[PDB]
Structure 1
Amino acid sequence: LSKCKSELIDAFGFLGGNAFMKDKKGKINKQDTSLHQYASLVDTEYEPFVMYIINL
């Protein structure tokens, strides 16, 4: 799953933004104060391209 997500982030992320694509392999999750936030509630970093991951 991880290696897959990384090959997608690198391939398509450019459309979202030149600085907004970082390398990530595994879901990065942040929740510390309002200086680091990750969620669809509030965020300050996320996926640059539209991606949801579905696991059973």
Structure 2
Amino acid sequence: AYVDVFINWFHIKALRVYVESVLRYGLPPHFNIKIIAVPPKNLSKCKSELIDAFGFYEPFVMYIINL
């Protein structure tokens, strides 16, 4: 289950990301969406860095942190 439900949750997250990128970002659908496994201590910095590099509940396009 820690694999099957894991895959189910990943697919659900992909669906949510598609829904957000089809709502926040506008049609026609397109996305440079990419998931970065951040260094353990860099998560706060990346949010600070990304929100800095964001042409804007997270603002701009979806930046929902995973796990």
Q: By the TM > 0.5 criterion, same fold?
A: no
So what's the TM-score if we normalise by structure 1?
0.40
**Max Rg structure:** 2
So what's the TM-score if we normalise by structure 2?
0.37
Bigger fraction of residues in helix:
2
Bigger fraction of residues in strand:
2
